[PDB]
Design a binder for this molecule. Structure first.
Ligand SMILES: Cc1ccc(F)cc1CCCCOc1ccc(C(=O)Nc2cccc3c2O[C@H](C(=O)O)CN3CCCC(=O)O)cc1
Ligand SMILES: CC(C)CCC[C@@H](C)[C@H]1CC[C@H]2[C@@H]3CC=C4C[C@@H](O)CC[C@]4(C)[C@H]3CC[C@]12C
Ligand SMILES: CCCCCCCC/C=C\CCCCCCCC(=O)OC[C@H](O)CO
Ligand SMILES: CCCCCCCC/C=C\CCCCCCCC(=O)OC[C@H](O)CO
Ligand SMILES: CCCCCCCC/C=C\CCCCCCCC(=O)OC[C@H](O)CO
Ligand SMILES: CCCCCCCC/C=C\CCCCCCCC(=O)OC[C@H](O)CO
Ligand SMILES: CCCCCCCC/C=C\CCCCCCCC(=O)OC[C@H](O)CO
Ligand SMILES: CCCCCCCC/C=C\CCCCCCCC(=O)O
Ligand SMILES: CCCCCCCC/C=C\CCCCCCCC(=O)O
Ligand SMILES: CCCCCCCC/C=C\CCCCCCCC(=O)O
Ligand SMILES: CCCCCCCC/C=C\CCCCCCCC(=O)O
Ligand SMILES: CCCCCCCC/C=C\CCCCCCCC(=O)O
Ligand SMILES: CCCCCCCC/C=C\CCCCCCCC(=O)O
Length: 363
């Protein structure tokens, strides 16, 4: 079949591109992660696990490239071929779950921007669960260099066809479609919460500026406005935040009841309210960026690959090439592999003190 001629040129190129790009990206990302910083978070745990998985997988790519560069002749021994298969699939599904967990965590965080020792350890416990389950689910590959007159690895063949037809069925459903479903619900929930919270924040800021413009324009009415604002704040009852705001109000109302000092003190509420707003806004930015990048990764790297893989398995026959479908599969397999060098975009644009650690390293 002519696809083999296509493969022997196509795979070395993309595998080595992914190798070098991924070594640079992941090596630098892991170096940054491990830099000391005053605070740490569970999302750093999940990102670190993802980057380690990707770099381990990337370390296998020069061997696959060698395979194809030798005319599809494997020289590295039977165990190494087994490990090629195992590393490919363990990386793929560990990555999918680490991404899904990361999106879920960002949602749960944006719900509660203000309010633990335990969640750092919990992130490791969860990661360990994911590793155990995926590694145990994949050990089939370790139990199954086959060919004669040449040594062939990485190839679909009759011996394994039925096996993979069954295995696909589970990995398609639990390893791909269920996580993408979880992501789609997460997207819906992120958008809903973000829109509602920012509408509320705009209302809050607008009423504050109205009251402050009233105080700026017109001492008899200053006390009235301050008492109305104090009553509104008490009915709003972040105990320390409310107490700080109320203490601002009480200081202004004292400086009034004692016109220059009180009107000036009125402005101090504005900067504290802007910081209160910014905390929420940062949490929402992070969640939305994460979910968008992750959905794009899924559309590019994983769903086309699983679709074409499934159809390739279902229609496979011993003496037929199907070069066009097979070529499409080869390309989407490349994309799935390339996820391992794509993921540091997420570390850079949605990291947790990532740029802070990076600036520290630069110092
Ligand atoms: C079970 C489970 C559920 C949820 C999870 F999160 C995790 C798991 C554990 C997953 C364990 C692994 O599961 C699998 C593994 C493989 C599969 C599967 O279809 N394989 C498959 C399908 C079609 C072609 C090939 C194929 O693989 C061949 C090869 O590797 O040798 C090479 N080629 C040839 C590629 C083209 C070329 O180069 O000519 C399908 C499933
Ligand atoms: C992963 C892809 C397919 C997601 C696209 C799904 C579409 C249909 C989603 C994305 C954003 C979602 C919307 C987000 C916010 C709201 C406001 C809520 O009060 C009613 C539902 C509504 C209007 C959702 C409807 C469904 C929705 C429009
Ligand atoms: C990334 C770009 C790699 C493209 C490789 C390629 O297209 O090779 C096809 C050629 O026809 C194979 O002999
Ligand atoms: C580190 C990177 C080395 C990447 C090199 C991996 C590719 C192996 C090239 C090779 O030596 O094999 C070519 C083959 O012998 C032709 O006949
Ligand atoms: C929000 C939701 C958006 C994301 C939806 C996520 C997953 C749905 C996947 C549904 C895939 C159903 C395919 C079933 C099928 O085609 O089965 C073929 C054949 O009948 C079997 O042998
Ligand atoms: C490629 C596309 C990435 C697109 C990433 C889009 C990131 C947008 C995040 C954002 O702008 O935040 C919106 C929110 O309303 C502010 O709080
Ligand atoms: C990884 C990115 C895969 C690049 C896809 C482009 C490609 O494979 O082009 C095939 C070429 O046209 C052969 O006919
Ligand atoms: C073949 C190449 C495979 C990739 C190897 C890349 C090097 C491995 C790890 C690089 C990051 C090392 C982390 C050092 C952290 C320093 C510290 O602990 O402060
Ligand atoms: C990804 C390519 C193939 C790799 C096979 C599996 C390799 C596992 C390597 C690193 C996983 C690190 C495990 C740390 C999580 C355990 C944490 C804990 O138990 O508290
Ligand atoms: C999670 C989404 C629910 C998935 C439910 C049904 C889809 C699974 C059916 C497609 C697998 C058939 C592939 C095959 O024939 O091997
Ligand atoms: C796969 C089968 C899917 C079955 C579950 C389907 C929908 C459940 C969605 C749960 C959303 C509840 C979370 C909202 C919230 O956190 O307030
Ligand atoms: C992969 C994404 C699929 C596309 C889904 C399309 C639905 C988009 C709908 C709403 C997105 C709203 C973006 C946020 C606007 C914020 C403006 C504001 O809050 O003031
Ligand atoms: C392709 C290379 C880069 C584009 C990747 C997506 C960039 C997302 C940036 C999001 C943001 O600016 O907050």
């Amino acid at each position: 079949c002519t696809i083999e001629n296509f493969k022997r040129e196509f795979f070395p190129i993309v595998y080595l591109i992914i190798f070098f790009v991924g070594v640079l990206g992941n090596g630098l990302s892991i170096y940054v992660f491990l830099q000391p910083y005053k605070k740490s978070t569970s999302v750093n745990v999940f990102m670190l696990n993802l980057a380690i998985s990707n770099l381990l997988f990337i370390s296998t790519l020069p061997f696959r490239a060698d395979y194809y560069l030798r005319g599809s002749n494997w020289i590295f021994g039977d165990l190494a071929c087994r490990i090629m298969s195992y590393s490919l699939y363990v990386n793929m599904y560990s990555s999918i779950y680490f991404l899904t967990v990361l999106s879920v965590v960002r949602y749960l965080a944006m719900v509660h921007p203000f309010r633990h020792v335990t969640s750092i350890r919990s992130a490791w416990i969860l990661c360990g669960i994911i590793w155990i389950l995926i590694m145990a689910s994949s050990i089939m590959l370790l139990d199954s260099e086959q060919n004669g007159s040449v040594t062939s690895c990485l190839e679909l063949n009759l011996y394994k066809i039925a096996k993979l037809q069954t295995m696909n069925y589970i990995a398609l459903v639990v390893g791909c479609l269920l996580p993408f479903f979880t992501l789609s619900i997460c997207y819906l929930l992120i958008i809903r919460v973000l829109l509602k919270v920012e509408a509320d924040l705009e209302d809050n800021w607008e009423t504050l500026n109205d009251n402050l413009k009233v105080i700026e324009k017109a001492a008899a009415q200053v006390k009235d406005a301050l008492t109305k604002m104090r009553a509104a704040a008490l009915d709003a009852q972040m105990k320390d935040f409310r107490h700080g705001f109320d203490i601002l109000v009480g200081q202004i109302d004292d400086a009034l009841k004692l016109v220059k000092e009180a009107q000036a003190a009125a402005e101090q509420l504005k900067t504290t309210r802007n910081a209160y707003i910014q905390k929420y806004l940062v949490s929402h930015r992070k969640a939305l960026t994460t979910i968008i990048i992750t959905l794009i990764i899924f559309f590019l790297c994983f769903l086309p690959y699983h679709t074409l893989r499934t159809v390739h398995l279902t229609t496979w026959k011993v003496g037929l090439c199907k070069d066009r479908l097979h070529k499409a599969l080869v390309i989407t397999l490349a994309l799935a592999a390339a996820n391992a060098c794509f993921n540091p975009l997420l570390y850079y644009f949605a990291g947790e003190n990532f740029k802070d650690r990076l600036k520290s390293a630069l110092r």
